[PDB]
Amino acid sequence: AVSVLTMFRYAGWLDRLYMLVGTLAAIIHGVALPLMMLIFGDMTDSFASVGQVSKQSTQMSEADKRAMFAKLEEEMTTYAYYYTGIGAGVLIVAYIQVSFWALAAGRQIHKIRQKFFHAIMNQEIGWFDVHDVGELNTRLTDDVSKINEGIGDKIGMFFQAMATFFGGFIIGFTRGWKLTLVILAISPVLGLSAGIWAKILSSFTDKELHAYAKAGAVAEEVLAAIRTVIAFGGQKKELERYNNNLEEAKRLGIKKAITANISMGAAFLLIYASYALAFWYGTSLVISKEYSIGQVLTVFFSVLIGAFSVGQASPNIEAFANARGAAYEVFKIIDNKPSIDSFSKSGHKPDNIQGNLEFKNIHFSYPSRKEVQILKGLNLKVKSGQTVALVGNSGGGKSTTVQLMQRLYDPLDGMVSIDGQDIRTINVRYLREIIGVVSQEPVLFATTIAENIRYGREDVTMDEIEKAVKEANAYDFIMKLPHQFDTLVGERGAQLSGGQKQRIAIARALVRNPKILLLDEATSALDTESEAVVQAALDKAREGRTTIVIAHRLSTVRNADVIAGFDGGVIVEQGNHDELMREKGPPASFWRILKLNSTEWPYFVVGIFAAIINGGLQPAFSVIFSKVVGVFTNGGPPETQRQNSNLFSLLFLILGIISFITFFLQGFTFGKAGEILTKRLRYMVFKSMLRQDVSWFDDPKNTTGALTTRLANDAAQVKGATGSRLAVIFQNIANLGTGIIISLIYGWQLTLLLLAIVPIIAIAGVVEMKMLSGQALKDKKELEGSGKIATEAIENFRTVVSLTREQKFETMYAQSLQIPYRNAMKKAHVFGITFSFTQAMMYFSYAAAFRFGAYLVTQQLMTFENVLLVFSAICFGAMAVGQVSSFAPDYAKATVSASHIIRIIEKTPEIDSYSTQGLKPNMLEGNVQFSGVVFNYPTRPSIPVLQGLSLEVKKGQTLALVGSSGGGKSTVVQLLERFYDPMAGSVFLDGKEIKQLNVQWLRAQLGIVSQEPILFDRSIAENIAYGDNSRVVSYEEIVRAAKEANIHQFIDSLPDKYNTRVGDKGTQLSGGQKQRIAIARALVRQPHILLLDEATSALDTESEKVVQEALDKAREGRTVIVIAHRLSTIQNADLIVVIQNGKVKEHGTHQQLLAQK
Ligand SMILES: C[C@@H]1NC(=O)c2csc(n2)[C@H](CSSc2ccc([N+](=O)[O-])cc2[N+](=O)[O-])NC(=O)c2csc(n2)[C@H](C)NC(=O)c2csc1n2
């Protein structure tokens, strides 16, 4: 499913040169580093030779050396010159590499996009028929960008990294004959261990994901049917299950965090030591008088630098593979030679053709459904001047006879000839432009009428095409509203109705001036007044040329002289027409109060001191490194050299292991805090959802899947927001502060240069990142110019190919992408110049800083070891700054978004319910009055309902309030439970207003049942007990309620009734019997009033007969209000008081015919 060594065949010779020079520049840039390392090695060796000052006789005679210092400064001048030379060279070569590679990539993307659009716009219609619309355009938008990114930047950096790797190792094979073995023999063990660590991390992550999916799904379930959940008032009983399931996740997350942090600590341990090992073997070799300090430094620094570089190339290869796959698909679309081309200059030129259409053995089936043969052979001959009307169920399925006229499909063994010439020999474009097509629905574009008319044929004059449009129904639908010209009719700007779209489409068809016309569903389901005029246009078009008309409406059939239509594929001649039956008819977060949510200071205070002590490691490493170098440079080689070297190596590991245990403690506290905050925030958010009520849940802005993602992939954001954003900044600031102060202790002047060179590099990196991010943000805006035409073109391809206007869309796409082409070229140049800029300033600052340090050493004040200490400390601190930032969990990625969204939803107040300020009368008479109650949908206030409803309810009432649709009557029964609120109306119950009737105790007495008995995955016995849950929970009444519900006879299968739960649709109950289970739950509620809305969703049949049996037993037992849009249900209701929107009272059907049907 991939392709390689083919993605660049569409590049020109200049592009090949571009790529070659880019590769050469990348190779040079890669080779740059090892040479610099070797220079540094020999340069430090020269220091060690000169700066030894071992003999006091030289130190006293002739003003110390004062001449060896001259040789030293000459050597330093030469070294600094060669530094700046290689820095300028790296500048130039890196600029060349990045710029040429990215510009060649841009040219390739331009060519690929143009060819892709041209090919996809040229395929046969069946290709789109076996495919969809939006997915293709999404592919077009995404894969081109993926290919660009890859075969630009990633392949650009890959050769650079690989050349760096071979370079350092070659320096290794020159100066590190044994250093290489220890360094490369320690390499596999360290990398492998971190990998065993990555594998364990992945396993723990998968376990955590599986564990959270159990509970998250309990969650998705309680939400899906949240209306029932709030109706039965089981929030207090339900949050407990949510919490236990959540708990079987936070301990797993604690384990996962422990694993990740101990893995990081182990990686540090494997690096500090072994790095330690290298010094251990190198220093001993220097003691053996065969190697020097520079010899060790060059190989050690070089081999490692290269290994990093070679390891850095993995994401580049991943992007390359993605680009390979995407290129494979997009090329697969390309070169897909269709059966019809419509572009090749081939075929005979028919002229003065009458248009005698023919049909002989016409067999065809749609490629989407080849199983059903749409047409099974027809024999027919027609003559020009006699329009033919087809009558039947449809146009042979869907306008099939029309489809083969313009070669939109390919006939199978059937031959059609307009004038005795087969369509295959006739040129496709010429055949298209001589036949006019009328669409069933006239899709147009948001553009002015002028180009809509010009889409017909090659425009000769604006006035001429206007005169062509001067046919009837003009000057009113084209001049009154559209201001006589230049009005972008469509969804964007002065949207019109189809009555004018059909007329302008017919006007375009007349601009075609066809030999033959085709009419398809002129006014299919249009307004009955919009017709009777468009048909006049069709008739006057008929007077010009012969047409084939297919429509469901029979009005045109009388007008048509020849009526040759049938159904089922059996041809019926046009001898007579009377035989056929005549149918009658989001701000940011505080970052100070968010963390204040974590009131776990005993779990939190450990980290800050731990973070500082962790950041304190790196400058200590720099000090130890400087001391190791000074042991051989400013050393004591007469007396003792082994003692201090071995002591420094021991310091190397004790420091490594203390950093390891520091990371252990830091993880053990920070991951635990993050996981406990995860569970805390989630448990709150769940109860916040519960107190939000139906109002917010009915808001379409929030959906069930979106809210499940809200509970899923936003707590991890706060996890990083807690520790990472604080631990990282504390570590970085501690490192920088302690490095700065130790540099000040060991440096009074050079630190000024260090603090002057660091900020320019920092701001250069920041401006580079900001510029690339801004260009990426703009890329969407300029690429949307392509989409503004591509979306409409792909959507309306049927009409587009039905029209002759093909190349114009390609030209507009070419221009609207050519502007982004220049934009991308300039962006490429900016990216290249800024990358070369930052690299060049890095090298040049290295050179200048080291040269001025050398000058100050020649001043005999700060000796080399101090210079190396300060330089390495500052630069490694800055390098660690960004590196530590990367190890964080996407704080840079959107995170504060989910953070403050969670804050907002948690701070959300309860609009209604879940409060103690409720008055609960002990017993209720049930005297409800739904009189003068008016209220609408808060979520959709555009549609007002529930106007002027007057009702009276008493004990024994059987109000069968039934009305048309559901928008006017469902809310009536939906208001008894106060899911919504009455603001214009007033509701009285027991002489008391409902707004303070102890909402929980209110829902307690309501036996409401939803229309669809949606049920969650609780055990059947526990599911039945869920009725009166959060109330007294008791045994030996569930069986009593089940028996009273007359359900025991069927459910006695597996009579245990306790563990026979529905295991994710396992042991599925009958579709109509779930509502029976709902009835049983309502009965075990022991209400005083019951509300029913089940109606008959499925084919309940005999099961339905049993459910109104249950209903009538329930209503003769206790007062029940039945709501159902079924005539049989109300006829079953003996107490016939049907009221619909309050026009009538009591039994309407007896008083008037209205309620009956
Ligand atoms: C604990 C802290 N480390 C990190 O925060 C860290 C995380 S990722 C990484 N570093 C990279 C990938 S690792 S390179 C490497 C090099 C050599 C060996 N070995 O087994 O001899 C192992 C490894 N390794 O850990 O994969 N390191 C380099 O790019 C690299 C190449 S030269 C070099 N550093 C210089 C000489 N040393 C340090 O800067 C240094 C000393 S303390 C320290 N860093």
Ligand SMILES: *SC[C@@H]1NC(=O)c2csc(n2)[C@H](C)NC(=O)c2csc(n2)[C@H](C)NC(=O)c2csc1n2
């Ligand atoms: S004193 C200026 C500079 N400091 C940086 O922090 C810096 C800017 S860009 C950068 N570091 C990249 C991320 N560096 C490396 O990838 C890297 C790993 S090892 C290494 N560089 C060599 C040994 N050191 C430098 O190149 C260096 C010296 S000064 C400096 N960077």
